[PDB]
Ligand binder design. Structure first.
Ligand code: ATP
Ligand code: ATP
Ligand code: XZF
Ligand code: XZF
Lengths: 846, 847, 29
């Protein structure tokens, strides 16, 4: 009580050979041999079999790299190039299959109609004959297909046996001495001179050109994917697909090469068909090899006006054989087997395509009925399409379009083997080793050259329909993640250039601002991701750091899920940033890890962007110590610092994503800069790079500072320049008392004692301030509140204010004093405020 | 010395007008009007300026979006579709211009030569006159263009005045009553019965069909990018480029529409040209229309063999003029202007490509060229190509592929606007009143349709040569940064797993063996990062430290190894390795395997070093790493010109790679040898795989293992089974293990776990005997497996055993190191101990 | 569970037992 699975002979080889053998073998191959001669016909066959051999090797390498399921061709292409190029070629493969059902039932019906005219009486109408017969035949084929998959595989064997019987009949017939009405039509039994004179071309008519023969034959050698299309019923598709496909191609090619060279050595190109053309002694003259055998076709050859022979009579292969009705049976089998093999493939590819939710509302047809889960709804859709194209019944101009839907699949079956083999993902491990990627690119190019040679305006329609669906799938972005080779091309494309960076040494004319941004969870502080992603996009590096403060010291898998959530959040905003997190016991010791290790060779951060600690006056005085220690560590590691503040705050935690200030047009406002120390040029570069952006390009960069000589020489292009007024002068008293009573809870009331005893008493906590430093660094303390007054005077209603970050000497001043300066310097201002100081490096050399 | 800037009426509108106007205006348009009639010619003109106006709208939309430089056209295709279409289309667009220079100077050359045949005496054959004069004309244009673009604007203004006097001459000559000589050739003044006679087509000839007329005219209406390629020389492009480009189109279309009607309202289609055809009163009956004016043109119209008239004489508009030579002056202006516009617009694009750093294929630019940065090298390249194609002198065969190199650019320029509009690309917000993404998609459909309609095989070479350039470049800082950030979208699959190593070398030149080994199989495949921990105080970027860190990168580069160097500072090795594990890498390119060397003399150094060494592995297992430990017989540290040579630089030959797959770790034990065997040195080796099994299930599970190894497509040759691992080892080997573990033995008698910590805090590496009893079976397994390995793999090339794993708090460091040293002792080839992280790295399936 | 497993086919299939995790083999008991 298990579903049946097929071997390789009965499952791949028989079906591929039945699909390849059509009606060209019977009704137009002798004609091609007569027109083009044996040698050039052999060239045509061996030239049309090169393309299908190359595609067989490609589809055979692709299908032995894992386990294959239902879906056949579509499954193999989509899982190897992804849904964009896989779901656009799996919707026209099925449609082309359905129309192929239509165009082979039409041929079967035409043969039946031609049989019925002569023997008895034709029915209803010449053209309304090919409608009735085709519709009834497709209904019968639908029934036999819909009855199960062990009954169709019993019909295909019957058709194969019928074809073999026709071949044996023809070979037996071509070996008996010719009867009198048999030789009057051209057929002499076997010789040498007919062979010799049939070796060279004899073109006639408007259709008799070499390319006019290649155009007729080539679409009759494709059809090799009829066994790979039932890959869900084979019991070992990793051994059944290569052997079956390649053996089928070999055997059908031998069949063609034998039929042509055997028909061309028996029947002469010109014969009359009248039993009275026997040669009369002593009269006139011969016109050819015929008169040596006693027959006289001179009037034909002189007038070019008779019906029989290897050119003029299309059904010569019926006349030659011992019993023509068996050749008729062969034609019936050859035409019905292809229709059945197309009807099955359309449904089994469409069901797989509908399982994967790639297109809006065709998912109704991806349902299985029964134990084997046959697509009882795909069969009926293909039947409806085939009956619709059979009612038309004149498909002589539809065929060029359909035959180019099958050459877009040959061009993507071959590119999928080239692309996946030049990449070498570990895991790209096929067990069919007899292929080459350059011979697979060759086939991809030729399948597109031929598609235009055959007819240039149907290739245009085919490629237009391919791109329409390709673009739809790109713009909808479904989520599948099948691990294609396009996804593995990105990694080694990135690695090849990251390793390439090493070759170029460190210079001074390639400075870039590469930022390490201390965000925490990017959700919490978006106003600090936007500011940095404004001026580093498409120019330099930015990393969004994060320290997980806990004592766990183990990297649980759940942390990688969280790091995938934050990366996706960054990707929604279209920020070009990297996320990285570490684990430490406090915040100061995680940023040390990030500064020391992060980056890749030459692409490593050299600027530290950190928010401002708003609540430093109501937190434990040991956290401000860590906060100032971070800045001191950044200075020791030879970084540049940028402390950023806002009036309302940075942490937003204390659906849609949040919107901040740095996302909107800020036209007609000024960007104020207060240059107080030659840091090298970082205080000037950040607003210079910020103002070039469109959102900030309508702003007036104002610089408040020999200086004009130093400014214009770097061609920065700033609007104004000024001299700040008298920073030395004493500020008014109320602000000064505010400064002194702000720093009061760090007072010590120590009077004056020797440094030894002072340190003996400070040993517990270093953040407390003694009166010695207070009275020793009171001047520059006043200077900060004075300059805050100045800034609050000029920059009251600006759009972005940049000042210079002071440095407090280690050991000579505590951290509380430095944080008090940093506070009072930028308080009670409305716009965003930044405080930059570089690392004494020439950065304006660009 | 401020750079010169141009307005909209002299740097865009005039400069596009001159490029649109060619020689079809003077030699072919009257013929089109004669054949297709007035109405259908108007249809052709409007139907072919629809496309150019749509592309003008897209270019105008691009111009009002930020600021771009001169030659920065491809820069949207580059931004919106990747920098391999951007650069490729830019290269194609510049080459097409360079060829257009030659194809216009040849028209000027032909005009001058045919003028020479009439008046004076030609001095050479009529095919080397074209060559001998085209080169001189192009050289003169190169001189007056290399002079500076101030001396090119003046020439383009002179050329405009010349055309405007040719129009004045032609328009004056059609209001004057027809002279006896002129009227014999078919010229009559404005009369209504000629207007109504020419309103309908009169097709004749091989290419006298509507498609033939469209195919002659349409490539005479393009050239609307002549002023948009110099966006770096305009005063304010966002206001000058739309207003100028969209009025050049309008006024040239007006001129084309006016000439056709005015010329068709004057001249009959057929005429004789001999003054004998004055009518004879009373001589039968007339035939034709001119017989109402005094002229009989019957004999031609019956025999169809005269030479003049609007249908047979191409120069019919040079005779209706008041003075003939002014029309040839118009010809000279019309050809030399387009030749100059193309020469400037190709130099701009070449110089922009040579300045582009996301397209490092062209480059070729060294020292700066010119005080004003004139694109001197771009000019020389364009001049070279133009001369090379002049020397050919036959170009009607090359015309229909150079004319599709432009419609490829039109199609992609139009499609990138639609793409960037519909994907809501950040940085594309064009502030232009009349831009529609649908109207820009239509202009990209139509451009390709026309491209393939004009001639299909030439449109296939044009697409084919773009894809060769696209594929050739797929197979510095701004390119590495743009691809690394592109990995943030592609999401990981087990089918694409890559082993990304973090190699602990030290100074890379102390341990060449590790570097060579790990650079064998990660080469062109995955990441590897050399590591180095400078044990000591903390401080950084000392001028010396960076200069040291550059020397080791130079050493890695000389040896031809694709690796990164990374040094951190800590107080001991363990903390430095933790710092390196947690934070090294960039995004998805971060290590997930840690490879170290073997502690050669772990029995002589202080045991705290052994404790830290084993702690390194214990931490690697805590961060989800796979661990490889590499042991070599002589040692890895070479310290204890020329670069030293290791055994991993020689071809190994036909020797074997024995793998001992004991515990299932995911597949890393047997993915390293596979990748190792994809290389030249190891490509002849034989992979033998050993597994454990039972006596009386031997073949039944050998077959199962062989079936498993062939679902993975690994291609491993042998498979053996070891059924005697649970035996007892020989006596002296167990005695050696027990003596080699003696110094670390606690020797505490037998006490409970509560008090063992009491005397083991001082030395946490010591082994309590209650704890050495519970590990006797596993301890003897290592000796037995060592005997097996010596028995089999004595003469192999590389040996792989799985790493035993020890629980925290259940096995001390000394015991673990004793196992690691027992498993791989007294054995000649390199030994590697691998342990994956218990996750699958191999797969059967496709999804 | 907690004991290291010799190679089997059952760990690599899809649909019966689970390969021990790295934390199960390494963390304390
Ligand atoms: N866990 C963390 N990881 C990384 N960076 C952090 C972390 N915590 C804080 N920072 C950085 O240090 C800055 C100052 O820390 P602090 O906790 O004072 O900010 P905050 O109090 O969250 O800001 P707000 O006043 O807006 O709440 C933060 O703005 C942030 O830039
Ligand atoms: N300063 C260092 N930085 C980075 N890695 C190191 C450093 N020192 C040692 N290692 C790595 O740790 C391993 C431990 O070996 P250790 O240095 O303790 O003894 P060794 O005999 O010097 O090592 P080897 O056998 O490699 O010479 C070494 O093999 C090496 O790979
Ligand atoms: C003869 N066929 C040609 C198309 S040219 C004849 C024309 F269509 F024009 F009539 N190519 C294929 C290819 C495949 Cl792959 C399959 S199938 N069943 O494997 O999927 C079937 C066919 S075919 O039978 O339609
Ligand atoms: C008259 N030209 C036609 C091509 S007609 C066929 C041919 F002559 F090429 F054989 N198309 C363009 C388009 C542009 Cl956009 C530019 S330009 N100056 O912007 O670069 C120049 C030209 S043209 O001068 O070559």
């Amino acid at each position: 009580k298990e579903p049946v699975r097929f071997g390789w002979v009965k499952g791949v080889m028989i079906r591929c050979m039945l699909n390849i053998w059509g009606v060209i073998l019977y009704l137009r191959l002798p004609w091609i041999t007569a027109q083009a001669g044996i040698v050039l016909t052999w060239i045509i066959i061996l030239l049309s079999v090169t393309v299908t051999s190359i595609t067989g090797l490609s589809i055979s390498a692709i299908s032995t790299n894992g386990k294959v399921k239902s879906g056949g061709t579509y499954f193999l292409i989509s899982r190897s190039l992804g849904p964009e190029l896989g779901g656009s070629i799996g919707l026209i493969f099925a449609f082309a299959n359905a129309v192929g059902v239509a165009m082979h039932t039409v041929g079967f019906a035409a043969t039946v109609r031609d049989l019925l005219q002569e023997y008895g009486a034709p029915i209803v109408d010449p053209i309304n004959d090919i409608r009735i017969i085709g519709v009834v035949s497709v209904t019968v084929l639908l029934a036999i297909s819909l009855a199960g998959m062990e009954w169709e595989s019993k019909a295909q064997v019957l058709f194969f046996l019928v074809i073999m019987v026709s071949f044996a009949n023809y070979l037996v017939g071509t070996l008996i001495p010719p009867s009198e009405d048999k030789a009057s039509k051209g057929f002499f039994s076997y010789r040498a001179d007919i062979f010799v004179q049939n070796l060279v071309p004899d073109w006639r008519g408007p259709d008799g050109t070499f390319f006019g023969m290649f155009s007729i034959f080539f679409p009759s050698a494709t059809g090799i994917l009829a066994g790979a299309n039932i890959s869900g019923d084979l019991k070992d598709p990793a051994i059944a697909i290569p052997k079956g496909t390649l053996m089928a191609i070999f055997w059908t090619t031998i069949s063609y090469l034998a039929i042509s060279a055997t028909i061309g050595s028996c029947v002469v190109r010109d014969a009359s068909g009248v039993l009275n053309d026997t040669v009369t002694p002593g009269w006139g003259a011969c016109e050819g090899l015929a008169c040596s055998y006693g027959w006289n076709f001179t009037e034909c050859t002189q007038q070019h006006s008779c019906h029989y022979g290897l050119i003029n009579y299309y059904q010569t292969m019926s006349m030659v054989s011992g019993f023509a009705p068996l050749i008729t049976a062969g034609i019936f089998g050859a035409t019905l087997s292809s229709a059945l093999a197309c009807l099955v493939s359309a449904a089994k590819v469409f069901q797989c395509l509908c399982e994967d939710q790639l297109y809006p509302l065709i998912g109704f047809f991806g349902k299985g009925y029964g134990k084997n889960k046959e697509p009882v709804r795909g069969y009926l859709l293909a039947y409806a399409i085939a009956v619709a194209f059979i009612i038309i019944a004149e498909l002589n101009t539809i065929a060029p379009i359909i035959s180019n839907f099958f050459l877009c699949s040959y061009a993507l079956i071959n590119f999928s083997c080239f692309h996946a083999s030049i990449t070498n993902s570990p895991g790209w491990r096929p067990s069919f080793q007899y292929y080459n990627k350059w011979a697979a690119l060759f086939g991809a190019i030729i399948s597109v050259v031929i598609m235009f040679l055959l007819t240039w305006w149907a290739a245009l329609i085919a490629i237009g329909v391919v791109l329409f669906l390709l673009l739809y799938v790109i713009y909808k972005k479904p989520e599948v993640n099948w691990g294609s080779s396009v996804q593995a091309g990105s990694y080694n494309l990135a690695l090849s250039y990251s390793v390439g960076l090493n070759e170029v040494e460190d210079h001074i004319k390639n400075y870039r601002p590469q930022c390490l941004v201390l965000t925490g969870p990017p959700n919490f502080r978006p106003a600090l991701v936007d500011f940095v992603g404004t001026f580093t996009r498409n120019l330099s590096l930015m990393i969004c750091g994060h320290v997980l403060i806990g004592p766990h010291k183990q990297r649980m898998p759940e942390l990688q899920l969280i790091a995938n959530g934050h990366t996706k959040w960054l990707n929604k905003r279209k920020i070009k940033a990297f996320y990285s997190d570490v684990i430490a016991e406090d915040l100061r010791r995680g940023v040390q890890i990030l500064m020391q290790a992060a980056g890749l060779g030459r692409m490593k951060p050299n600027i530290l962007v950190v928010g401002f600690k708003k609540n430093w006056q109501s937190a434990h005085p040991a956290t401000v110590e860590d906060y100032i220690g971070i800045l001191h560590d950044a200075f020791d590691f030879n970084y540049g610092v940028c402390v950023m503040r806002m009036r309302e705050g940075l942490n937003v935690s204390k659906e849609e994503q949040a919107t901040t200030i740095f996302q909107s047009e800020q036209g007609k406002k000024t960007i104020d800069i207060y240059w107080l120390f030659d840091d090298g040029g970082l205080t000037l570069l950040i607003p210079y790079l910020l103002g070039r952006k469109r959102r900030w390009s309508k702003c007036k960069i104002r610089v408040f500072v020999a200086i004009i000589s130093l400014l214009s020489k770097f061609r920065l292009g700033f609007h104004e320049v000024h001299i700040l007024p008298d920073i030395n002068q004493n500020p008014r008293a109320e602000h000064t008392k505010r400064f002194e009573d702000m720093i009061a809870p760090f007072r010590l009331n120590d009077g004056f004692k020797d440094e030894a005893t002072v340190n003996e008493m400070r040993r517990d906590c270093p953040w407390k301030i003694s009166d010695e430093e207070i009275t020793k660094n009171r001047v520059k303390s006043l200077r900060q509140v004075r300059l805050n007054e100045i800034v609050l005077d000029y920059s009251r209603d600006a759009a972005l204010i940049v000042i210079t970050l002071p440095i407090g000497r280690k050991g000579k001043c505590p951290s509380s004093l430095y944080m008090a300066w940093l506070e009072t310097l930028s308080q009670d201002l409305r716009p965003p405020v930044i405080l930059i100081r570089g690392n004494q490096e020439n950065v304006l050399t660009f």
